[PDB]
């Protein structure tokens, strides 16, 4: 199926406490594989996935230099936005960026993107056409104007079609045993009493990969999506994910409710009950 290469970047100012904290975190699909943190003792790009041991020392040196350059550029951006928005130099502000590309199972580019946010709000974003930008406010419009005169979209598009796609293909190839695996979810149902002769039934799905999964509760063959409660799929610290969805049912009738689990690692969906 399709795969993605994404970089989550964050620059955060802290007036009176030194330089902004700058961080880059990279993912191939749902797997963290590289990271840069300016607050580390000796800031360097570091591998976060075992298969990245396959890159030579030049890789790390070059990514570290790129990161330090990005760090300085963002330090400037923070000051620039203070001017665009007429804000004080005493408060903390945040710049966020998500950049990446997705390829199909054949390795060809499917889509690319780049979005910026200032203080948690949309700032500027690349349109699907990979040619123009859309600005959320008048400050971002200044940036859009600078980027159009500089050909920023064209440069980013060349990165997407070239560097992004090619290295994504290389990462999938090198970390194939990890990134192309499928860890089947293992499910269980827990039971908890409630006041009013009602029971909480909680369906758990553990140890699965990739992260996409569907957990539903059924009664009379109909999904109770409406009254269902749950948590966003979450990482479990070893490269796998977990999730749970619950429903409140009448005591003594738990047996009529069934949990359904659909995942890539389940040839046939799972069906369980208390």
């Amino acid at each position: 199926g399709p795969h993605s290469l994404r970089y989550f970047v964050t620059a955060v100012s802290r007036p009176g406490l030194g330089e902004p904290r700058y961080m880059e975190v990279g993912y191939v699909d749902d797997t963290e594989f590289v990271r840069f943190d300016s607050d580390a003792e000796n800031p360097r790009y570091e591998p976060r996935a075992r298969w990245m041991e396959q890159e030579g020392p030049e890789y790390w040196e070059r990514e570290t230099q790129k990161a330090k350059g990005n760090e300085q550029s963002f330090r400037v951006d923070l000051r620039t936005l203070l001017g665009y928005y007429n804000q004080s130099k005493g408060g903390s502000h945040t710049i966020q960026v998500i950049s990446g590309c997705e390829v199909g199972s054949d390795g060809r580019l499917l889509r690319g993107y780049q979005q910026y946010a200032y203080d948690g709000c949309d700032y500027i974003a690349l349109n699907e056409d990979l040619k123009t930008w859309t600005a959320a406010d008048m400050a971002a419009l200044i940036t859009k104007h600078k980027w159009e005169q500089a050909g920023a979209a064209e440069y980013y598009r060349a990165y997407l079609e070239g560097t992004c796609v090619e290295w994504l293909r290389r990462y999938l190839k090198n970390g194939n045993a990890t990134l192309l695996r499928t860890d089947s979810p293992k499910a269980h149902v827990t039971h908890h009493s409630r006041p009013e002769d009602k029971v909480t039934l909680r369906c758990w799905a553990l140890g699965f990969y990739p992260a996409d999964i569907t957990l539903t509760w059924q009664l009379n063959g109909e999904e109770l999506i409406q009254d269902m409660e749950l948590v966003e799929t979450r990482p479990a610290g070893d490269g796998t994910f977990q999730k749970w969805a619950s429903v409140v049912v009448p005591l003594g009738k738990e047996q009529y409710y069934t949990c359904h689990v659909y995942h890539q690692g389940l040839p046939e969906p799972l069906t369980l009950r208390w």
């Binding site: 990514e63 951006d77 780049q114 910026y116 990165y159 560097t163 992004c164």
Partner: peptide, 8 residues
């Protein structure tokens, strides 16, 4: 590999 970001 990441992109070299452009100034705002």
């Amino acid at each position: 590999r990441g992109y070299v970001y452009q100034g705002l």
